From a paper:
Desensitization of these ‘non-NMDA’ receptors involves rearrangement of a dimer formed by neighbouring ligand-binding domains (LBDs). The LBD is a clam-shell structure comprising an ‘upper’ (D1) and ‘lower’ (D2) lobe, with ligands bound between the two lobes, and the LBD dimer is formed by contacts across D1 lobes. Specifically, in KARs, additional contacts are formed at the dimer apex (grey surface), including a chloride ion bound on the twofold symmetry axis and two sodium ions bound on either side.
Numbering used by the authors:
A (entry chain A): 432 to 492, 495 to 544, 555, 566, 667 to 799
B (entry chain B): 432 to 544, 555, 566, 667 to 799
Amino acid sequence: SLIVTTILEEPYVLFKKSDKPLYGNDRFEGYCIDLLRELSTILGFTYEIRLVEDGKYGAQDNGQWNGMVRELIDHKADLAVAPLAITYVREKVIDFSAPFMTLGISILYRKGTPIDSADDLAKQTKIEYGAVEDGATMTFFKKSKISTYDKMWAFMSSRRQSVLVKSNEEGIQRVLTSDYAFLMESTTIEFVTQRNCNLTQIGGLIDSKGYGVGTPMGSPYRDKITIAILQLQEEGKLHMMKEKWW
Amino acid sequence: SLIVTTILEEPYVLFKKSDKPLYGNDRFEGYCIDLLRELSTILGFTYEIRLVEDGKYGAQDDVNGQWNGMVRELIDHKADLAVAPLAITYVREKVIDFSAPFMTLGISILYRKGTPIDSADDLAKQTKIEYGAVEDGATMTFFKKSKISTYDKMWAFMSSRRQSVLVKSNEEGIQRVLTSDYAFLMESTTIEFVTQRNCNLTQIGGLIDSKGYGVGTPMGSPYRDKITIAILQLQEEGKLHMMKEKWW
Ligand SMILES: C=C(C)[C@H]1CN[C@H](C(=O)O)[C@H]1CC(=O)O
Ligand SMILES: C=C(C)[C@H]1CN[C@H](C(=O)O)[C@H]1CC(=O)O
């Protein structure tokens, strides 16, 4: 039996709503749960789903790793199945399957302003902007030497206290209730904009990355999961699953 | 010193044009060459570029189970890396390893502008307009393996007309499109290069699937995750994007 570490994030993983109380794996549904189930069928493993205790994805603080990334490092889990960005920093410490979805950083804002691009935000200060603290998105800006993104980070880091948030939900509410643009992942933006008609992605994608299944470094499951993902992708299951949940 | 297998394909890999004949790695330029050089700098390896002898990418001979092309080179440890527009596929992954993708693309349709043909389904449900792909390439293999109804049907068509509608290069496919009533199934990245250069050609519909190109290594090779890590760095600092801009 595999321990599968995950995190609450709609529509990837959520508590299934029902009257009768649900137990163990039944409690969960979502794109990632469907994925996990499809993988389980192809590969022939059983599993226990567990929500990462510290509720973090995985960042380096003292140099300590946290979240689902730490769980894999310490062998406290076999797989991480969540919207976990495949990144340089994470890849040095864990392994990732080939990506099951592709995405990019982009901007969440209200409809019908003059704001048209990242550069439009960067060259002003009236409209505040930020991102989830210590997430892949934030780290991209923190490390970027592209001139526009450098400026944005200078803005964000200096207003760290007030513009950086602890979740996508927190960021979304900010956008809805104040003059604020949220830097978030395009896949999540798409879900949100379908459900709030007054909101909209601004500009295009700022970068490119994927979500992958995480495994402890050197794990034999890696390429097995990779092969499974490619199979699923080519036969259009991954696509149906996106269509289902979006 | 690493042995790097590759193949001539614009704008990924090409012979540098010059009066004086050039030697070794100097002979080559392109997106993939730039990539290889950037990887070499990050990882600190030296290398020798070699064009794959049989001039194939990699399919399994379905009579005798022999692999060919760059995939075969890696399997046999005749090379350390394959750097080319080598699609990361289910069948190939079972026999070699791939880095994380340096480019994302998908199968699409190259056709002439301003017909009623709008999708793969439109092609599949007729026979007047012929269609095909590079023989034994990733695109053909996708249709050959697909259980999607429309694609299954397309493969029935193609395989039975194997004689005449499957081609040996992108270039051959393109000439076909230009000079007869034919739609060419090819990779979207290549479509884009081509359409920028022939003003009467266009992409029909959207992407039929999604895949990446990755650097190939022999299974269990340690180079894998090193190269992957290098690719993620290059992707995150926007160098991969600049490189595409440069060559397109
Ligand atoms: C905090 C969110 C939910 C996570 C999700 N994926 C990204 C990650 O892998 O860290 C983060 C998005 C972001 O940083 O904007
Ligand atoms: C025969 C072309 C040039 C190659 C290139 N990449 C794909 C591959 O990795 O096989 C093939 C495209 C295709 O099959 O349409």
